[PDB]
Amino acid sequence: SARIGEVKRETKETNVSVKINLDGHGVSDSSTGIPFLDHMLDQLASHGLFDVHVRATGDTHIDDHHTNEDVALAIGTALLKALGERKGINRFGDFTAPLDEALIHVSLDLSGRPYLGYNLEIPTQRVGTYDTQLVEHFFQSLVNTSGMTLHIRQLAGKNSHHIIEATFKAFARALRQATESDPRR
Amino acid sequence: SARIGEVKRETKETNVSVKINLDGHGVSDSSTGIPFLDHMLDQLASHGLFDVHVRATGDTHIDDHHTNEDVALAIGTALLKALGERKGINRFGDFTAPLDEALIHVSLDLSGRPYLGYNLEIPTQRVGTYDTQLVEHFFQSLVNTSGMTLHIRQLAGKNSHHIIEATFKAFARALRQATESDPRR
Amino acid sequence: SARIGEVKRETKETNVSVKINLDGHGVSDSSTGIPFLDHMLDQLASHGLFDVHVRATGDTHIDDHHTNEDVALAIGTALLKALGERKGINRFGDFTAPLDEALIHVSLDLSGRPYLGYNLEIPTQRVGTYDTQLVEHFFQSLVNTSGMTLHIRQLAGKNSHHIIEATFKAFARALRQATESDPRR
Amino acid sequence: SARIGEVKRETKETNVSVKINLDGHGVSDSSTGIPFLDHMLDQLASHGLFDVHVRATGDTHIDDHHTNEDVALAIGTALLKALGERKGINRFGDFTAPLDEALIHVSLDLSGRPYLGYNLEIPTQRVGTYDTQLVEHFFQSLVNTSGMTLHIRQLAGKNSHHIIEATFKAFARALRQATESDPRR
Amino acid sequence: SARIGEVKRETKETNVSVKINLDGHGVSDSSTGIPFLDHMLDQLASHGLFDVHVRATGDTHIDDHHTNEDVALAIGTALLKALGERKGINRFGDFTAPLDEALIHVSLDLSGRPYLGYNLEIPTQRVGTYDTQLVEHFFQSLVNTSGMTLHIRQLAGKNSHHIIEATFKAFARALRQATESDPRR
Amino acid sequence: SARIGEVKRETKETNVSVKINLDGHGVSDSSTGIPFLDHMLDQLASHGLFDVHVRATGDTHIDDHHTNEDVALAIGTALLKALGERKGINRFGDFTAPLDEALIHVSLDLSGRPYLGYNLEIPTQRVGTYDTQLVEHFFQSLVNTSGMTLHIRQLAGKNSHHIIEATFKAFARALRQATESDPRR
Ligand SMILES: [Cl-]
Ligand SMILES: [Cl-]
Ligand SMILES: [Cl-]
Ligand SMILES: [Mn+2]
Ligand SMILES: [Mn+2]
Ligand SMILES: [Mn+2]
Ligand SMILES: [Mn+2]
Ligand SMILES: [Mn+2]
Ligand SMILES: [Mn+2]
Ligand SMILES: [Mn+2]
Ligand SMILES: [Mn+2]
Ligand SMILES: [Mn+2]
Ligand SMILES: [Mn+2]
Ligand SMILES: [Mn+2]
Ligand SMILES: [Mn+2]
């Protein structure tokens, strides 16, 4: 029986719907109003083998910040819901992924205690129209509602898109590991 | 009897109308042609319990600068008008507000002598489409027409939107304090 | 009608019961198995005018860590419960308190987003039998379950007991401010 | 047929009995006379899925050193015995585990050649009553009798209990990996 | 049906034949005219569970460079051929292996885009008769024809043979992981 | 008989068609969806006397990265195809071109071994709407599919458009030299 979490959340600023299947096939269905974030959520699905359905609208004329934040918060809650009683899972994930010259290590523990350790140094301010400060905020907000211990470490990288995408690949693979069944539990 | 100041000001560059109620309920009604500034003026209303009505148009195809400046000048004048004879008010305000990792101290004196002390270090050039140099200019122009002594001190912060928004929260709360009745005066 | 939050939480390591009245009279009733923590919780009650009832037992033969953490987590949850819908409160608190040569600034926002900014430099490892690393962990854990934005800044201090106690005084006064009714809301 | 190693060792200073099942269920049964070490050995069992039975007595009135050392030596020998001919196992283990802000990488090879690489910087001298110098000595002594190549690397951390516990989690998971069957061997 | 790639390549300088089975049993059959390289290719087979058959002759009286390069190029092509359509594989590999005091991290992606990140600092010029500059060139040439993203990071090490051998162990294990079936794909 | 290479390549992200005549007249016919890249490809044609026909579409709403990369990859392949057996050509090219204050040296070898040496320091993040990180990626991707040894050295320059355009002029002239007939071969 697949582990599925669903969240709908509305504020004056944003409207967000998330559905995540931890036992998915990598089905990617994300439309946030932030194209670069959509691309990253596609990576989350494809590299994590999650099914990810996201819809968001919001006040992107002000900036992408509120949308990005509210999407992340809802994803964190959806993950928490999907995990249920967390019985029999690996709990810990650890993966280091490259994307060309970029190399990003992610380690996480589905601990119930939120913590983000993050040291990315993204050398440009905009990837497409996406404000690169928002990457940290995405992970911070996700951690806060999921109750995840998450460390993200930049080991190499120069191209901003590579750095951010490698982060999502590594995160997805680490989260896949953590959420999967431990065969001895 | 509520303290209300109104200003209409037209130049070749901009057209601005401001109405501020110092004894308001936080009614936010701001449309400047600069969405991020609108968002900040909403914070001013909600955190200061001012009623803030602003309309502006201007030469935003050149850049947001003239609009931002002329809005600020008019707000400063409206504040001055609303304050009237300044009898029986606290006069001084002092508040430090966070927004997540950002922490901003504002101290002000409704002194009749303009002065801005400002040390924000906003680490990105654009929040949405808003040029972050314009934050200092907003406060400088406001001080100049209001005749306010204003100090803004960045105690912490990394996210530009957080830094700027925390500034407006702290300013609003400090200005609320300064404009309110001193119960012993 | 007084705002009261109650939490009972048991783990393999600890057993904790907390009851907090936000609208209290400073009634202090704290027994955690960690005498220095009891003393600090007494300060929280007396300086914040909270009624604080805490009972904890745990694995203090290993060290005080699990007890300290679980007490803090439960207090954060109790605060959250007590706050209820958070209508009409100040929400923000800001206070700087001395204790002799020590001087500690606390700023907080009852925001729903956990964040701790903390820069205390406590110059000794043990105050009585209390491990001074546990002060940061107390506030971090409290923030995490309460969903509080909390900044703690050491402005001066040399004596470890003074530094820590001044922190609790400042925190208590800032939290009192934040939880109290805003008379214009 | 489960791989079980047993050691009894007596000196003038200490008396130690160890039984370890490499193919266990995480049964934790450790009483060394050093409560913090007991807690760490519980982590070894739970995170490694070893069954760990330890009893020790010794000259803890002098300090915990001889007990800690003799426990570690006996565990290393028990591991060696349990491994038997080492046929068909992964041999290598590599895992990085967090505990909140702490992040510890362990890499090991069941090589038959003892080596410890260790760079932990534990910022306090006592965790509970446990001398934090003894952590290095525990791993060194274990390596020496097991004939293990072991590298322990502190990637992040501030709280001493977190640093040490994360080390044991990472070690346990790496040792589980190394001792498990390689499905292609 | 085992994935086997075969390459024969002749130049004026060298003559090389390679056959690699990705689904092997660790059969090592390598004779390049460079004994140290043979030893490393044996590690590749044994730690990766590849079957590796290599024969090379060349102008080693000039130096080992052309042989080393042409062997590496052919291995990269053989890997590419063996991988075929790359369907259903893990694609990514990440492993850190010790050899006594040496500790080497390898991360790779079978991406189709060649990239080598390499930071080994091998402290001697010759291991046996093998020029230690040739290690980097081996991996660079392999990457270039395989279309692999490869990062090699020296975490510790002093003995040149240990450093280089640990690199091949880590690489072999990471490449095994990447080339193996993903059980959910 | 003119040396013409043609490539059509489609991915989920981009659709690219390239036709290059090494023995051209400088016919420029490039439409990539990235106006600045079009301008640079026009320089390639005019300064190299290549006929360059490029059409690309792609996911430029995410950013220009995938388009830029896929165009470059296809150009590299087209060059490789056009070169055919590479008989009788100069093979090496070396040219240094100014554009006002900018001065860029390009040296290349049509070697069959991909390598990019690149040290441009482009002082602004956007030239028009073009992300200046993409210049390095363009040349890297081109090198990777063409099998070119390419060195790009910034000798002087301040204006980003000048720096990048001078690079394309120098590259075009060096590539013209390398691809032309050696009159003694
Ligand atoms: Cl590392
Ligand atoms: Cl201060
Ligand atoms: Cl030169
Ligand atoms: Mn935010
Ligand atoms: Mn991408
Ligand atoms: Mn101006
Ligand atoms: Mn905002
Ligand atoms: Mn803890
Ligand atoms: Mn005291
Ligand atoms: Mn000793
Ligand atoms: Mn513990
Ligand atoms: Mn060479
Ligand atoms: Mn060897
Ligand atoms: Mn790319
Ligand atoms: Mn031009």
Amino acid, res. C147: G
Rounded to whole angstroms, the Cα distance separating D133 from C48 reads: 41
Ligand positioned closest to the Cα atom of B43: 7
Binding residues of C for Mn(2+): 39, 65-66, 69, 137, 161-162, 165
Torsion of CA B83, B89, B90, B91, to 10 degrees: 40
> Are D and F neighbours with ≥3 CB pairs closer than 8 A?
no
| Residue E27: CA count within 13 A, CB half-sphere | 12
The rounded Å distance from CA F62 to ligand 15 centre is: 25
Q: How far apart are the first and last CA of chain A?
A: 17
Q: What's the rounded Cα separation, in Å, for the pair C56 and A111? A: 22
Q: Which amino acid is at F57?
A: T
Task: Find the domain containing C176 and state its range.
Answer: 91-185
Residue C94 is nearest to which of B49, B95, B100, comparing CB atoms?
Answer: B95
Cα atoms in the Cβ-side hemisphere of radius 13 Å centred on D31: 3
Cα–Cα nearest to F64, from B129, A130, A59: A130
Q: In this structure, are C64 and C102 located in the same domain?
A: no
Contact (Cβ atoms closer than 8 angstroms) between residue D116 and residue D152: yes
> C50 is written with which tokens?
């909270």
List, edge to edge, every strand of the sheet that includes E51-58: E4-10, E14-21, E51-58, E28-31
C-alpha A102/C-alpha A119 separation (Å) is 14
Distance (Å) from the alpha carbon of C55 to chain D's nearest alpha carbon: 21
The answer to whether E and C touch (≥3 CB pairs < 8 Å) is: no
Q: Are residues B86 and B108 in the same domain?
A: no
- Whether A42 and A10 have beta carbons less than 8 Å apart is answered as no
Q: Retrieve residue D149's tokens.
A: 């190549």
SS3 F174: helix
CA distance D19 to D55: 9
CA distance A95 to chain E (A): 7
Among C92, C115, C117, beta carbon nearest to B173: C92
Q: Which residues of E touch D92 (CB under 8 A)?
A: 95, 97, 169, 173
Judge residue C121's burial from the number of C-beta atoms within 10 Å of its C-beta, 0-12 exposed, 13-18 middle, 19 or more buried.
Answer: exposed
Task: Find out whether E81 and E5 touch, Cβ atoms under 8 Å.
Answer: yes
Q: What are phi and psi of D164, to 5 degrees?
A: -70, -45
User: In the Cβ-directed half-sphere of F92, how many Cα atoms lie within 13 Å?
Assistant: 2
Instruction: Give every CB contact of residue E12 below 8 A, 6+ residues apart in sequence.
Output: none
**Protein residues near ligand 12, an ion, with CB under 5 A:** E 69
Same domain flag for D100 and D81:
no
Which runs of consecutive H residues, i.e. helices, occur in chain A? 35-48, 65-83, 134-146, 160-179
Calculate Rg over the CA atoms of chain C: 15
What is d(CA F56, CA C80) in angstroms, rounded to the nearest whole number? 55
Overall domain count for chain F? 2
| CA B21 to the chain's CA centroid | 14
Task: Phi first, then psi: give them for residue B28, nearest 5 degrees.
Answer: -110, 120
Separation between Cα atoms, residue C117 and residue E108, nearest integer Å: 38
Greatest C-alpha distance within chain F: 51
CA distances from A114 to A150, A177, C145, D43, E147 (A): 8, 19, 10, 21, 39
Nearest CA in chain C to D158: C133
β-pair type (B28-31, B51-58)? parallel
B65 and B95 inside one domain? no
CA geometry: angle at E174 spanning E171 and E175, to 5°? 80
Provide DSSP, C106-162: EEEE--SS-EEEE----SSSEETTEETTHHHHHHHHHHHHHT-EEEEEEEE---HHH
Task: Tell me the one-letter amino acid at A146.
Answer: S
| SS3 state of residue D59 | coil
- Asked whether the CA dihedral C73, C79, C81, C84 is positive or negative, the reply is negative
| Token pair for B72 | 């600020």
Nearest to D128 among C62, C136, C137 (CB): C62
**What residues contact E119, with CB distance under 8 A and at least 6 apart?**
E152, E153, E154
Measured at the CA of D50, the angle between CA D46 and CA D53, to 5 degrees, comes to 95
Q: Are D160 and C133 a contacting pair at CB < 8 A?
A: yes
Q: Are E152 and E116 in contact (CB under 8 A)?
A: yes
As a whole number of angstroms, the distance between CA A166 and CA A172 comes to 10
Q: Which two tokens stand for residue F83?
A: 């070169």
Q: Which residues contact C7 (CB under 8 A, 6 or more apart)?
A: C16, C17, C18, C19, C74, C75, C77, C78, C81
How many CA atoms, within 13 angstroms, populate the side-chain half-sphere of residue E98? 29
Give the method used. Answer: X-ray
Whether residues B64 and B131 fall in one domain? no
Q: Shortest Cα distance from A100 to chain E (angstroms)?
A: 6
Contacts of D38 (CB under 8 A, 6+ apart): C62, D30, D31, D32
Q: Assess whether F28 and F113 both reside in one domain.
A: no
Considering just the CA atoms, what is the radius of gyration of chain B in Å?
15
State the Cα–Cα distance between residues F136 and F30, nearest whole angstrom.
20
Taking a C-beta distance cutoff of 8 angstroms, is the pair E103, E175 a contact? no
Contact F67, F60 (CB under 8 A): yes
Angle (CA) E13-F76-A167 rounded to 5° is 100
Q: E128-146 in b/e burial notation, b at 16+ Cβ within 10 A?
A: eebbbebbebbbbbbbbbb
SS3 E76: helix
Pair of tokens at residue D24:
């266990």
* Residue located via tokens 């790639």: E5
Nearest residue to A175 via CA among A8, A21, A27? A21
* Set of chain A residues whose Cβ sits within 8 Å of the Cβ of C141: 113
Which domain-ending residue is among B90, B122, B151?
B90
Both A32 and A77 in one domain: the answer is yes
Distance, in angstroms, between A116 CA and closest chain F CA?
Answer: 26
Could you tell me if F71 and F1 lie in one domain? Answer: yes
CA angle A168, A169, A175 (to 5 degrees): 85
Say how far apart CA D110 and CA E145 lie, in whole Å: 34
d(CA F24, CA F17): 18
E134 with E68: CB under 8 angstroms?
Answer: yes
CB B106 within 8 A of CB B48: no
Cα nearest neighbour of E173 on chain D: D92
Element (H, E) at B31: strand B28-31
CA distance C160 to C128: 10
**What order of strands is seen across the sheet that includes strand E149-156?**
E92-99, E102-109, E149-156, E115-118
DSSP helix/strand/coil, C18: strand
Burial zone of F125 (CB within 10 Å; 0-12 exposed, 13-18 middle, 19+ buried): middle
Residue numbers followed by a gap, chain E, C–N over 2.5 Å: none
Considering only the beta carbons, identify the residue of A62, A125, A137 that sits closest to B128.
A62
Residue ranges of alpha helices (H) inside chain E are 35-48, 65-83, 134-146, 160-179
Q: What is the resolution of this structure in A?
A: 1.3
Q: Which residues of D touch E100 (CB under 8 A)?
A: 111, 113, 115, 149
User: Contact, A169 vs A43, CB < 8 A?
Assistant: yes
| Statement to judge: residues E80 and E111 lie in one domain | no
Q: Regarding beta strands D149-156 and E126-127, do their DSSP bridges make them parallel or antiparallel, or are they unpaired?
A: unpaired
- Non-local (6+) Cβ contacts of D22 within 8 A are D2, D3, D4, D5, D50, D79, D82, D83, D179
Q: A73 with A140: CB under 8 angstroms?
A: no
Domain boundary among D70, D90, D110: D90
Asked if residue E80 lies in contact with residue E22, where contact means CB atoms within 8 angstroms, the answer is no
Separation of alpha carbons D153 and E156, rounded Å:
10
The answer, yes or no, to whether D and A have at least 3 beta-carbon pairs within 8 Å is yes
Structure tokens at A175: 């989260």
Of D92, D108, D150, Cβ closest to residue E173: D92
Residues C182 and C99 grouped into a single domain = yes
Q: Residue D114, Cα to own-chain centre: how many angstroms?
A: 14
F104: phi then psi, degrees, rounded to nearest 5: -130, 130
Amino acid identity at F43: Q
Residues C25 and C50 in one domain: yes
Q: What angle do CA F111, F117, F123 make, to 5 degrees?
A: 145
Q: Are C181 and C88 contacting, i.e. CB atoms less than 8 angstroms apart? A: yes
Contact check, Cβ <8 Å, A109/D98: yes
Residue F39 marked ligand-binding? yes
Do E94 and A99 lie within an 8 Å CB cutoff?
A: no
DSSP β-bridge partners for residue D99 = D102
Cβ contacts of B165 on chain A, cutoff 8 Å: none
Do the Cβ atoms of E23 and E1 come closer than 8 Å? no
The interface residues of chain E toward chain D in range 10-29, judged by CB-CB distance below 8 A, are 25
Is B119 buried (19+), middle (13-18) or exposed (0-12) by CB count in 10 A?
Answer: exposed
Which is it for the CA torsion A111, A113, A119, A122, positive or negative? Answer: positive
Angle at which helices F134-146 and F65-83 pack, to 10 degrees?
Answer: 30
Instruction: Give the span between the Cα atoms of D46 and E97, in whole angstroms.
Output: 24
Taking Cα atoms as reference points, which of D94, D102, A157 lies closest to residue C137?
A: D102
A113 contacts in chain C (CB < 8 Å):
141, 144
CA–CA separation, F148 and F143 (whole Å): 5
Contact B179, B47 (CB under 8 A): no
Vertex F59: Cα angle to F58 and F62 (nearest 5): 155
Geometric angle at alpha carbon F67, from F64 and F69, rounded to 5°: 100
Q: C34 and C122 share a domain?
A: no
Helix or strand or coil: residue C105? strand
* Contact assignment for E100 to D113 by CB distance below 8 Å: yes
**End residue of a domain, out of B90, B111, B144:** B90
Whether A8 and chain F come into contact, CB under 8 Å, resolves to no
Task: Calculate Rg over the CA atoms of chain D.
Answer: 15
Interface of E with F in 85-124 (CB under 8 A): 113-114
CA distance F26 to chain A (A): 32
Greatest Cα pair distance in chain B: 51
CATH number, position B143: 3.30.230.40
